[PDB]
């Protein structure tokens, strides 16, 4: 119940965390955290605004050593990708991880899928799946005024 309340409060104040970021702190697994979250939302007769991909951008890119420019680039990529429906029905966290990966690979500071998965708590397979959907549309998602040393025109 305490873990569910903490998750609800974090979601409400506008700095939502992921269930995996509360499980890593609490002594229970994600399943019970989610069950108690739903039970509390049902009992309290309250609701929480749906999480957006931009909410996990700042924390994910601050845990990583990415600069602020790469953070803004990833946020813009993810927002445009969700607007363009390139990732239909996929969790916002996977989309955020894919945007962070592409922004890091295109920028001077490069990060592999493993580190991004550990930071965001997303399996590298999910990162690849969410990255291939937005792979062909890499350039138009980037900010127009974006400096880089590794061309956005070529990426893994």
């Amino acid at each position: 119940i305490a873990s569910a309340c903490l998750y609800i409060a974090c979601r409400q104040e506008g700095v939502p965390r992921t269930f995996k970021e509360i499980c890593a702190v609490s002594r229970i697994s994600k399943k019970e955290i989610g069950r108690c979250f739903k039970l509390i939302l049902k009992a309290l007769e309250t609701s929480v605004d749906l999480i957006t991909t931009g909410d996990f951008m700042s924390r994910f890119c601050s845990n990583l050593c990415l600069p602020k420019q790469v953070q803004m680039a990833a946020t813009h990529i993810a927002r445009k990708a969700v607007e363009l429906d390139l990732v239909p029905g996929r969790s916002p966290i996977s989309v955020a991880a894919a945007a962070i990966y592409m922004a890091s690979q295109a920028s001077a500071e490069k990060r592999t899928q493993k580190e991004i998965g550990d930071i965001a708590g997303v399996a590298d397979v999910t990162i690849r799946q969410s990255y291939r959907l937005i792979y062909p549309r890499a350039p138009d998602l980037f900010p127009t005024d974006f400096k880089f040393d590794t061309p956005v025109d070529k990426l893994p």
């Binding site: 890593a24 702190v25 609490s26 002594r27």
Partner: protein, 49 residues
């Protein structure tokens, strides 16, 4: 003369002993239950802070 350092070191050992006592109590509950314990969850960070 007990300056800031030695004064702070006096507090830290009392607060660190509580931290080590707390993890012992937390671990003992899980070990007796038969299940291993998570180290991150055993540590009470508010004790020192």
């Amino acid at each position: 003369l007990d300056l800031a350092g030695p004064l702070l070191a006096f507090l830290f050992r009392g607060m660190f002993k509580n931290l080590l006592k707390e993890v012992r109590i937390y671990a003992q509950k899980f070990i007796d239950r038969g299940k291993d314990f998570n180290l991150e969850l055993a540590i009470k960070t508010r004790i020192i802070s």
